[PDB]
PDB file of C-alpha atoms and ligand atoms in Angstrom:
ATOM      1  CA  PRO J   1     -24.808   4.038   4.628  1.00 49.57           C
ATOM      2  CA  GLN J   2     -21.674   2.609   6.407  1.00 51.06           C
ATOM      3  CA  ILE J   3     -21.992  -1.212   6.434  1.00 50.20           C
ATOM      4  CA  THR J   4     -19.812  -3.423   8.731  1.00 51.67           C
ATOM      5  CA  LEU J   5     -18.539  -6.957   8.025  1.00 50.53           C
ATOM      6  CA  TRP J   6     -19.243  -9.004  11.116  1.00 49.71           C
ATOM      7  CA  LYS J   7     -21.893 -10.533   9.243  1.00 51.82           C
ATOM      8  CA  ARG J   8     -22.035 -11.023   5.294  1.00 50.26           C
ATOM      9  CA  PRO J   9     -22.941  -7.666   3.645  1.00 47.99           C
ATOM     10  CA  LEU J  10     -26.394  -8.422   2.156  1.00 49.32           C
ATOM     11  CA  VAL J  11     -28.688  -5.437   1.123  1.00 49.39           C
ATOM     12  CA  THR J  12     -31.896  -5.328  -0.280  1.00 49.20           C
ATOM     13  CA  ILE J  13     -31.978  -4.822  -4.279  1.00 46.45           C
ATOM     14  CA  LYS J  14     -35.097  -4.295  -6.568  1.00 44.78           C
ATOM     15  CA  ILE J  15     -34.683  -5.481 -10.289  1.00 43.65           C
ATOM     16  CA  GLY J  16     -37.211  -6.407 -12.858  1.00 43.59           C
ATOM     17  CA  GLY J  17     -39.610  -5.199 -10.473  1.00 42.77           C
ATOM     18  CA  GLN J  18     -38.622  -7.937  -7.777  1.00 42.14           C
ATOM     19  CA  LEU J  19     -37.174  -7.661  -4.551  1.00 43.41           C
ATOM     20  CA  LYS J  20     -34.215  -9.478  -3.832  1.00 41.28           C
ATOM     21  CA  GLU J  21     -31.106  -9.712  -1.424  1.00 42.53           C
ATOM     22  CA  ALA J  22     -27.592  -9.508  -2.604  1.00 41.63           C
ATOM     23  CA  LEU J  23     -24.084  -9.611  -1.369  1.00 38.88           C
ATOM     24  CA  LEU J  24     -21.914  -6.250  -1.664  1.00 39.81           C
ATOM     25  CA  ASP J  25     -19.196  -7.807  -3.182  1.00 40.26           C
ATOM     26  CA  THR J  26     -15.667  -5.910  -3.580  1.00 44.97           C
ATOM     27  CA  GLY J  27     -14.353  -9.522  -4.765  1.00 45.81           C
ATOM     28  CA  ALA J  28     -16.609  -9.485  -8.075  1.00 47.31           C
ATOM     29  CA  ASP J  29     -15.299  -7.594 -11.055  1.00 46.46           C
ATOM     30  CA  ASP J  30     -19.320  -8.127 -12.501  1.00 46.02           C
ATOM     31  CA  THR J  31     -22.786  -8.324 -10.608  1.00 46.08           C
ATOM     32  CA  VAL J  32     -24.174 -11.893 -11.175  1.00 43.71           C
ATOM     33  CA  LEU J  33     -27.602 -13.045  -9.942  1.00 47.47           C
ATOM     34  CA  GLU J  34     -29.667 -16.137  -9.632  1.00 47.93           C
ATOM     35  CA  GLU J  35     -31.879 -17.104 -12.788  1.00 47.20           C
ATOM     36  CA  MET J  36     -34.342 -14.667 -13.813  1.00 51.08           C
ATOM     37  CA  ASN J  37     -36.071 -13.360 -17.074  1.00 53.25           C
ATOM     38  CA  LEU J  38     -34.834  -9.892 -17.803  1.00 54.73           C
ATOM     39  CA  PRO J  39     -35.714  -7.435 -20.784  1.00 55.62           C
ATOM     40  CA  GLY J  40     -35.044  -9.010 -24.074  1.00 53.41           C
ATOM     41  CA  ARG J  41     -31.382  -9.272 -25.209  1.00 52.25           C
ATOM     42  CA  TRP J  42     -28.253 -11.034 -24.149  1.00 53.39           C
ATOM     43  CA  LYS J  43     -24.658 -12.544 -25.023  1.00 53.74           C
ATOM     44  CA  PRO J  44     -23.096 -15.395 -23.699  1.00 53.55           C
ATOM     45  CA  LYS J  45     -20.390 -15.188 -21.002  1.00 53.23           C
ATOM     46  CA  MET J  46     -18.633 -16.818 -18.539  1.00 52.25           C
ATOM     47  CA  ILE J  47     -17.227 -15.918 -15.218  1.00 53.94           C
ATOM     48  CA  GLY J  48     -14.842 -17.754 -12.621  1.00 52.46           C
ATOM     49  CA  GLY J  49     -13.791 -18.061  -8.988  1.00 54.05           C
ATOM     50  CA  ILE J  50     -13.238 -20.676  -6.389  1.00 55.68           C
ATOM     51  CA  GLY J  51     -13.691 -23.871  -8.076  1.00 52.28           C
ATOM     52  CA  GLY J  52     -13.677 -22.729 -11.853  1.00 52.78           C
ATOM     53  CA  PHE J  53     -16.205 -21.276 -14.277  1.00 53.80           C
ATOM     54  CA  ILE J  54     -19.831 -21.006 -15.029  1.00 52.66           C
ATOM     55  CA  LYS J  55     -21.790 -19.764 -18.042  1.00 53.54           C
ATOM     56  CA  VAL J  56     -24.302 -16.921 -17.734  1.00 53.40           C
ATOM     57  CA  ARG J  57     -26.072 -14.492 -19.714  1.00 56.55           C
ATOM     58  CA  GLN J  58     -25.138 -11.054 -20.204  1.00 58.48           C
ATOM     59  CA  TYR J  59     -27.559  -8.074 -20.264  1.00 53.85           C
ATOM     60  CA  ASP J  60     -26.515  -4.493 -20.853  1.00 53.36           C
ATOM     61  CA  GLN J  61     -27.932  -1.335 -19.415  1.00 51.69           C
ATOM     62  CA  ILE J  62     -30.288  -2.880 -16.907  1.00 54.96           C
ATOM     63  CA  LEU J  63     -31.796  -0.752 -14.268  1.00 55.67           C
ATOM     64  CA  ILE J  64     -31.152  -1.901 -10.628  1.00 59.23           C
ATOM     65  CA  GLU J  65     -31.954  -0.212  -7.193  1.00 60.50           C
ATOM     66  CA  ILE J  66     -29.237  -0.935  -4.509  1.00 63.22           C
ATOM     67  CA  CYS J  67     -30.272  -0.306  -1.013  1.00 67.92           C
ATOM     68  CA  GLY J  68     -32.225   2.953  -2.564  1.00 66.12           C
ATOM     69  CA  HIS J  69     -29.604   3.820  -4.775  1.00 66.77           C
ATOM     70  CA  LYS J  70     -30.265   3.511  -8.586  1.00 69.02           C
ATOM     71  CA  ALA J  71     -27.972   2.283 -11.030  1.00 69.34           C
ATOM     72  CA  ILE J  72     -27.670   1.116 -14.602  1.00 66.77           C
ATOM     73  CA  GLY J  73     -25.157  -1.502 -15.761  1.00 67.63           C
ATOM     74  CA  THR J  74     -24.401  -4.906 -16.977  1.00 64.31           C
ATOM     75  CA  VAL J  75     -26.212  -7.719 -15.054  1.00 62.60           C
ATOM     76  CA  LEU J  76     -25.235 -11.454 -15.295  1.00 66.56           C
ATOM     77  CA  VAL J  77     -27.650 -14.067 -14.770  1.00 65.69           C
ATOM     78  CA  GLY J  78     -26.805 -17.748 -14.274  1.00 64.42           C
ATOM     79  CA  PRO J  79     -26.165 -20.663 -11.906  1.00 64.05           C
ATOM     80  CA  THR J  80     -24.534 -18.473  -8.815  1.00 67.42           C
ATOM     81  CA  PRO J  81     -25.720 -19.646  -5.409  1.00 65.71           C
ATOM     82  CA  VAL J  82     -26.446 -15.734  -4.027  1.00 62.54           C
ATOM     83  CA  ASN J  83     -26.882 -12.746  -5.763  1.00 63.35           C
ATOM     84  CA  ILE J  84     -23.837 -10.573  -5.800  1.00 60.79           C
ATOM     85  CA  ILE J  85     -23.523  -6.835  -6.641  1.00 58.08           C
ATOM     86  CA  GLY J  86     -19.777  -6.508  -8.113  1.00 59.49           C
ATOM     87  CA  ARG J  87     -17.670  -3.274  -8.605  1.00 61.23           C
ATOM     88  CA  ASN J  88     -19.376  -2.643 -11.798  1.00 58.84           C
ATOM     89  CA  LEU J  89     -22.257  -1.276  -9.668  1.00 56.99           C
ATOM     90  CA  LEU J  90     -20.547  -0.735  -6.641  1.00 53.53           C
ATOM     91  CA  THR J  91     -18.623   2.203  -8.384  1.00 52.89           C
ATOM     92  CA  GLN J  92     -21.924   3.623  -9.657  1.00 56.96           C
ATOM     93  CA  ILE J  93     -23.352   3.942  -6.188  1.00 55.93           C
ATOM     94  CA  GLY J  94     -20.020   5.185  -4.787  1.00 53.94           C
ATOM     95  CA  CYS J  95     -19.194   2.340  -2.594  1.00 55.99           C
ATOM     96  CA  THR J  96     -15.647   2.447  -0.909  1.00 55.34           C
ATOM     97  CA  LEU J  97     -13.818   0.181   1.300  1.00 55.34           C
ATOM     98  CA  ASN J  98     -12.715   2.262   4.383  1.00 53.94           C
ATOM     99  CA  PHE J  99     -10.216   1.127   7.376  1.00 56.37           C
TER     100      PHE J  99
ATOM    101  CA  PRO Q   1      -7.477   4.345   4.214  1.00 58.94           C
ATOM    102  CA  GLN Q   2     -10.603   4.773   2.095  1.00 59.77           C
ATOM    103  CA  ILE Q   3     -10.319   2.566  -0.865  1.00 60.36           C
ATOM    104  CA  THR Q   4     -12.358   2.762  -4.266  1.00 56.98           C
ATOM    105  CA  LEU Q   5     -13.759   0.049  -6.324  1.00 58.93           C
ATOM    106  CA  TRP Q   6     -12.849   1.298  -9.973  1.00 63.86           C
ATOM    107  CA  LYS Q   7     -10.125  -1.123  -9.826  1.00 63.85           C
ATOM    108  CA  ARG Q   8      -9.896  -4.457  -8.081  1.00 66.62           C
ATOM    109  CA  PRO Q   9      -9.131  -3.586  -4.114  1.00 67.52           C
ATOM    110  CA  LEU Q  10      -5.695  -5.319  -4.102  1.00 66.26           C
ATOM    111  CA  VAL Q  11      -3.751  -4.292  -1.196  1.00 66.79           C
ATOM    112  CA  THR Q  12      -0.004  -5.373   0.113  1.00 65.30           C
ATOM    113  CA  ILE Q  13       0.107  -7.837   2.848  1.00 63.29           C
ATOM    114  CA  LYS Q  14       2.865  -9.339   4.902  1.00 64.82           C
ATOM    115  CA  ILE Q  15       2.600 -13.102   6.263  1.00 64.37           C
ATOM    116  CA  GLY Q  16       5.336 -15.648   7.325  1.00 64.71           C
ATOM    117  CA  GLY Q  17       7.811 -13.098   6.504  1.00 65.11           C
ATOM    118  CA  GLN Q  18       7.039 -12.674   2.964  1.00 65.48           C
ATOM    119  CA  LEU Q  19       5.123  -9.907   0.868  1.00 63.44           C
ATOM    120  CA  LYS Q  20       2.099 -10.482  -0.953  1.00 62.16           C
ATOM    121  CA  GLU Q  21      -0.683  -8.968  -2.511  1.00 63.12           C
ATOM    122  CA  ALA Q  22      -4.488  -9.817  -1.712  1.00 63.10           C
ATOM    123  CA  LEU Q  23      -7.994  -8.834  -2.446  1.00 61.99           C
ATOM    124  CA  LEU Q  24     -10.088  -7.131   0.174  1.00 60.98           C
ATOM    125  CA  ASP Q  25     -13.060  -9.240  -0.282  1.00 59.57           C
ATOM    126  CA  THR Q  26     -16.255  -8.406   1.413  1.00 58.65           C
ATOM    127  CA  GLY Q  27     -17.607 -11.566  -0.635  1.00 60.11           C
ATOM    128  CA  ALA Q  28     -15.294 -13.686   1.421  1.00 61.55           C
ATOM    129  CA  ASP Q  29     -16.558 -15.273   4.711  1.00 62.61           C
ATOM    130  CA  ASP Q  30     -12.738 -16.702   5.000  1.00 62.26           C
ATOM    131  CA  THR Q  31      -9.259 -15.410   4.076  1.00 62.34           C
ATOM    132  CA  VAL Q  32      -7.459 -17.676   1.667  1.00 65.37           C
ATOM    133  CA  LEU Q  33      -4.205 -17.798  -0.060  1.00 64.18           C
ATOM    134  CA  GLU Q  34      -2.050 -19.349  -2.447  1.00 64.03           C
ATOM    135  CA  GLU Q  35      -0.034 -22.218  -1.579  1.00 61.48           C
ATOM    136  CA  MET Q  36       2.487 -21.657   1.131  1.00 64.22           C
ATOM    137  CA  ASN Q  37       4.225 -23.334   4.335  1.00 64.03           C
ATOM    138  CA  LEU Q  38       2.855 -21.631   7.565  1.00 61.72           C
ATOM    139  CA  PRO Q  39       3.720 -22.731  11.214  1.00 60.94           C
ATOM    140  CA  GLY Q  40       3.026 -26.355  11.992  1.00 57.40           C
ATOM    141  CA  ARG Q  41      -0.527 -27.270  12.153  1.00 55.30           C
ATOM    142  CA  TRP Q  42      -3.568 -27.648  10.290  1.00 55.61           C
ATOM    143  CA  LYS Q  43      -6.721 -29.297   9.957  1.00 53.32           C
ATOM    144  CA  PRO Q  44      -8.686 -29.983   6.576  1.00 49.04           C
ATOM    145  CA  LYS Q  45     -11.463 -27.695   5.504  1.00 49.28           C
ATOM    146  CA  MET Q  46     -13.538 -26.767   2.211  1.00 45.83           C
ATOM    147  CA  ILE Q  47     -14.697 -23.643   0.560  1.00 45.15           C
ATOM    148  CA  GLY Q  48     -16.648 -22.876  -2.071  1.00 46.78           C
ATOM    149  CA  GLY Q  49     -17.878 -20.159  -4.499  1.00 49.02           C
ATOM    150  CA  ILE Q  50     -18.566 -19.387  -7.998  1.00 49.86           C
ATOM    151  CA  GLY Q  51     -17.730 -23.157  -9.853  1.00 45.91           C
ATOM    152  CA  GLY Q  52     -18.096 -25.155  -6.591  1.00 44.63           C
ATOM    153  CA  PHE Q  53     -15.712 -26.017  -3.912  1.00 48.09           C
ATOM    154  CA  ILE Q  54     -11.876 -26.579  -3.222  1.00 48.26           C
ATOM    155  CA  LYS Q  55      -9.842 -28.584  -0.252  1.00 47.48           C
ATOM    156  CA  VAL Q  56      -7.814 -26.148   1.730  1.00 47.57           C
ATOM    157  CA  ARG Q  57      -5.721 -26.408   4.948  1.00 48.31           C
ATOM    158  CA  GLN Q  58      -6.729 -24.372   7.545  1.00 49.49           C
ATOM    159  CA  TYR Q  59      -4.490 -22.826  10.094  1.00 45.92           C
ATOM    160  CA  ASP Q  60      -5.296 -20.739  13.085  1.00 46.60           C
ATOM    161  CA  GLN Q  61      -3.901 -17.493  15.051  1.00 51.78           C
ATOM    162  CA  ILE Q  62      -1.741 -16.664  12.376  1.00 52.96           C
ATOM    163  CA  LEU Q  63      -0.275 -12.985  12.130  1.00 55.38           C
ATOM    164  CA  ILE Q  64      -0.623 -11.346   9.158  1.00 57.54           C
ATOM    165  CA  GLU Q  65      -0.305  -7.263   8.063  1.00 56.05           C
ATOM    166  CA  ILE Q  66      -2.787  -6.136   5.985  1.00 57.23           C
ATOM    167  CA  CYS Q  67      -1.717  -2.345   4.219  1.00 56.89           C
ATOM    168  CA  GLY Q  68       0.236  -1.720   7.670  1.00 54.47           C
ATOM    169  CA  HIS Q  69      -2.679  -3.167  10.253  1.00 54.96           C
ATOM    170  CA  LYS Q  70      -1.951  -6.276  12.165  1.00 56.94           C
ATOM    171  CA  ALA Q  71      -4.251  -9.044  12.748  1.00 57.07           C
ATOM    172  CA  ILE Q  72      -4.150 -12.587  14.207  1.00 56.65           C
ATOM    173  CA  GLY Q  73      -6.777 -15.074  12.833  1.00 56.32           C
ATOM    174  CA  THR Q  74      -7.327 -18.100  10.882  1.00 57.90           C
ATOM    175  CA  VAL Q  75      -5.723 -18.290   7.352  1.00 57.41           C
ATOM    176  CA  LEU Q  76      -6.343 -20.857   4.838  1.00 58.10           C
ATOM    177  CA  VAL Q  77      -4.379 -22.096   2.132  1.00 60.68           C
ATOM    178  CA  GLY Q  78      -5.018 -24.007  -0.841  1.00 60.08           C
ATOM    179  CA  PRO Q  79      -5.600 -23.635  -4.741  1.00 60.43           C
ATOM    180  CA  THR Q  80      -7.048 -20.346  -5.051  1.00 57.25           C
ATOM    181  CA  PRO Q  81      -6.091 -18.343  -7.910  1.00 57.52           C
ATOM    182  CA  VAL Q  82      -6.067 -14.881  -6.137  1.00 56.72           C
ATOM    183  CA  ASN Q  83      -5.004 -14.083  -2.463  1.00 55.93           C
ATOM    184  CA  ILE Q  84      -8.184 -13.071  -0.657  1.00 53.97           C
ATOM    185  CA  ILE Q  85      -8.541 -11.088   2.705  1.00 54.31           C
ATOM    186  CA  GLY Q  86     -11.916 -12.107   3.899  1.00 49.41           C
ATOM    187  CA  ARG Q  87     -14.246 -10.738   6.804  1.00 52.68           C
ATOM    188  CA  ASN Q  88     -12.837 -12.669   9.333  1.00 50.95           C
ATOM    189  CA  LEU Q  89      -9.727 -10.573   9.012  1.00 53.68           C
ATOM    190  CA  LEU Q  90     -11.575  -7.188   7.373  1.00 53.57           C
ATOM    191  CA  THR Q  91     -13.445  -7.083  10.893  1.00 54.15           C
ATOM    192  CA  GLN Q  92     -10.597  -7.033  12.640  1.00 56.37           C
ATOM    193  CA  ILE Q  93      -8.874  -4.058  10.769  1.00 55.53           C
ATOM    194  CA  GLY Q  94     -11.849  -2.337  11.130  1.00 55.00           C
ATOM    195  CA  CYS Q  95     -12.800  -2.217   7.524  1.00 56.09           C
ATOM    196  CA  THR Q  96     -16.469  -1.296   6.500  1.00 54.69           C
ATOM    197  CA  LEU Q  97     -18.347  -0.712   3.137  1.00 54.15           C
ATOM    198  CA  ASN Q  98     -19.362   2.975   2.569  1.00 51.91           C
ATOM    199  CA  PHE Q  99     -21.913   4.583  -0.026  1.00 54.30           C
TER     200      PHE Q  99
HETATM  201  C1  3TL X   1     -18.467 -13.341  -8.082  1.00 53.25           C
HETATM  202  C2  3TL X   1     -17.586 -13.701  -9.445  1.00 53.25           C
HETATM  203  C3  3TL X   1     -18.453 -12.709 -10.406  1.00 53.25           C
HETATM  204  C4  3TL X   1     -16.298 -13.572  -8.973  1.00 53.25           C
HETATM  205  N1  3TL X   1     -15.474 -13.580  -9.825  1.00 53.25           N
HETATM  206  C5  3TL X   1     -14.691 -12.739 -10.490  1.00 53.25           C
HETATM  207  O1  3TL X   1     -14.925 -11.362 -10.389  1.00 53.25           O
HETATM  208  C6  3TL X   1     -13.714 -13.227 -11.362  1.00 53.25           C
HETATM  209  C7  3TL X   1     -12.180 -12.731 -11.229  1.00 53.25           C
HETATM  210  N2  3TL X   1     -13.954 -12.170 -12.650  1.00 53.25           N
HETATM  211  C8  3TL X   1     -14.428 -12.994 -13.736  1.00 53.25           C
HETATM  212  O2  3TL X   1     -14.668 -14.288 -13.940  1.00 53.25           O
HETATM  213  O3  3TL X   1     -14.343 -12.114 -14.854  1.00 53.25           O
HETATM  214  C9  3TL X   1     -14.433 -13.247 -16.320  1.00 53.25           C
HETATM  215  C10 3TL X   1     -13.120 -13.618 -16.819  1.00 53.25           C
HETATM  216  C11 3TL X   1     -13.374 -14.661 -17.852  1.00 53.25           C
HETATM  217  C12 3TL X   1     -12.405 -15.149 -18.117  1.00 53.25           C
HETATM  218  C13 3TL X   1     -11.124 -15.019 -17.629  1.00 53.25           C
HETATM  219  C14 3TL X   1     -11.120 -14.262 -16.536  1.00 53.25           C
HETATM  220  C15 3TL X   1     -12.037 -13.574 -15.997  1.00 53.25           C
HETATM  221  C16 3TL X   1     -15.797 -14.079  -7.902  1.00 53.25           C
HETATM  222  O4  3TL X   1     -16.030 -15.408  -7.593  1.00 53.25           O
HETATM  223  N3  3TL X   1     -15.422 -13.488  -6.604  1.00 53.25           N
HETATM  224  C17 3TL X   1     -14.408 -13.956  -5.566  1.00 53.25           C
HETATM  225  C18 3TL X   1     -12.784 -13.974  -5.392  1.00 53.25           C
HETATM  226  C19 3TL X   1     -12.141 -14.915  -6.510  1.00 53.25           C
HETATM  227  C20 3TL X   1     -11.462 -14.168  -7.862  1.00 53.25           C
HETATM  228  C21 3TL X   1     -10.821 -15.190  -8.619  1.00 53.25           C
HETATM  229  C22 3TL X   1     -10.919 -16.508  -8.273  1.00 53.25           C
HETATM  230  C23 3TL X   1     -11.386 -17.113  -7.024  1.00 53.25           C
HETATM  231  C24 3TL X   1     -11.950 -16.174  -6.119  1.00 53.25           C
HETATM  232  C25 3TL X   1     -14.799 -13.993  -4.566  1.00 53.25           C
HETATM  233  O5  3TL X   1     -14.884 -12.509  -4.085  1.00 53.25           O
HETATM  234  C1  3TL X   2     -13.242 -16.171  -1.454  1.00 52.14           C
HETATM  235  C2  3TL X   2     -13.921 -17.554  -1.242  1.00 52.14           C
HETATM  236  C3  3TL X   2     -13.626 -18.074   0.191  1.00 52.14           C
HETATM  237  C4  3TL X   2     -15.526 -17.211  -1.245  1.00 52.14           C
HETATM  238  N1  3TL X   2     -16.698 -17.973  -0.498  1.00 52.14           N
HETATM  239  C5  3TL X   2     -17.062 -17.959   0.645  1.00 52.14           C
HETATM  240  O1  3TL X   2     -17.053 -17.184   1.248  1.00 52.14           O
HETATM  241  C6  3TL X   2     -18.038 -19.013   0.805  1.00 52.14           C
HETATM  242  C7  3TL X   2     -19.736 -18.579   1.045  1.00 52.14           C
HETATM  243  N2  3TL X   2     -17.895 -19.427   2.316  1.00 52.14           N
HETATM  244  C8  3TL X   2     -17.810 -20.593   2.044  1.00 52.14           C
HETATM  245  O2  3TL X   2     -17.205 -22.184   1.363  1.00 52.14           O
HETATM  246  O3  3TL X   2     -17.392 -21.259   3.626  1.00 52.14           O
HETATM  247  C9  3TL X   2     -17.396 -22.719   3.535  1.00 52.14           C
HETATM  248  C10 3TL X   2     -18.724 -23.630   3.534  1.00 52.14           C
HETATM  249  C11 3TL X   2     -18.438 -24.884   3.539  1.00 52.14           C
HETATM  250  C12 3TL X   2     -19.566 -25.863   3.387  1.00 52.14           C
HETATM  251  C13 3TL X   2     -20.547 -25.095   3.128  1.00 52.14           C
HETATM  252  C14 3TL X   2     -20.862 -23.906   2.968  1.00 52.14           C
HETATM  253  C15 3TL X   2     -19.849 -22.899   3.342  1.00 52.14           C
HETATM  254  C16 3TL X   2     -16.328 -16.582  -2.324  1.00 52.14           C
HETATM  255  O4  3TL X   2     -15.853 -17.410  -3.287  1.00 52.14           O
HETATM  256  N3  3TL X   2     -16.792 -15.303  -2.693  1.00 52.14           N
HETATM  257  C17 3TL X   2     -17.610 -15.265  -3.928  1.00 52.14           C
HETATM  258  C18 3TL X   2     -19.208 -14.872  -3.606  1.00 52.14           C
HETATM  259  C19 3TL X   2     -19.937 -16.338  -3.545  1.00 52.14           C
HETATM  260  C20 3TL X   2     -20.330 -16.924  -2.373  1.00 52.14           C
HETATM  261  C21 3TL X   2     -21.235 -18.370  -2.651  1.00 52.14           C
HETATM  262  C22 3TL X   2     -20.812 -18.611  -3.849  1.00 52.14           C
HETATM  263  C23 3TL X   2     -20.458 -18.149  -4.946  1.00 52.14           C
HETATM  264  C24 3TL X   2     -19.781 -16.827  -4.925  1.00 52.14           C
HETATM  265  C25 3TL X   2     -16.985 -13.908  -4.397  1.00 52.14           C
HETATM  266  O5  3TL X   2     -16.946 -12.741  -3.376  1.00 52.14           O
END
């Protein structure tokens, strides 16, 4: 679909069997979600943005549905206040910015 | 144009007579730029993201060219590490996310 920006670009995602909402975020190199258990194995990672850095857990090859579109990729989990779908997965779903 | 997300979505902007690069950021409610003098008058504001908050100066009705497209709107200036074009101006230029 084509999404407009009058409103925050929040879409439905499905991950680890749970339904969530997440921001389609062209300003995010990475995908970062609120705290959640995910299959087995992680390595430590840090991400920064406005305000500095947070420590997150990196999980690779995780399956996520984004507004119906399946993708498999790296998902970070940590103390973010909003679920964010970054360019890592946005690419896989064929997402472009158009104006 | 249609921009893809393999790479960060950095575009050329022109503001206050200066050429800069800025991120087309669907995850930004607001437009926030590195430190710079701008016509006269501001009011204090704070913005947060990953890592918490920063204090910025809010300037209204500022003219910016974004990749050739003129827009007039609110521009924040403060201690951001990257120039960010948020939904406030992205709307004005007709920017949509498509997948
Ligand atoms: C959602 C986050 C994962 C996001 N941050 C990022 O994508 C950042 C650049 N990437 C990032 O932290 O990657 C890891 C890293 C680690 C050490 C050194 C440098 C990079 C973000 O806060 N994005 C924001 C823009 C931004 C970028 C940098 C700084 C401030 C704001 C609004 O789009
Ligand atoms: C570039 C910033 C202006 C940006 N932040 C924002 O747009 C935030 C939500 N808006 C924001 O701070 O607006 C003002 C405000 C003030 C008080 C209370 C609530 C809101 C941002 O860091 N965007 C990031 C996503 C995000 C949002 C919230 C938290 C963490 C990351 C990556 O896209």
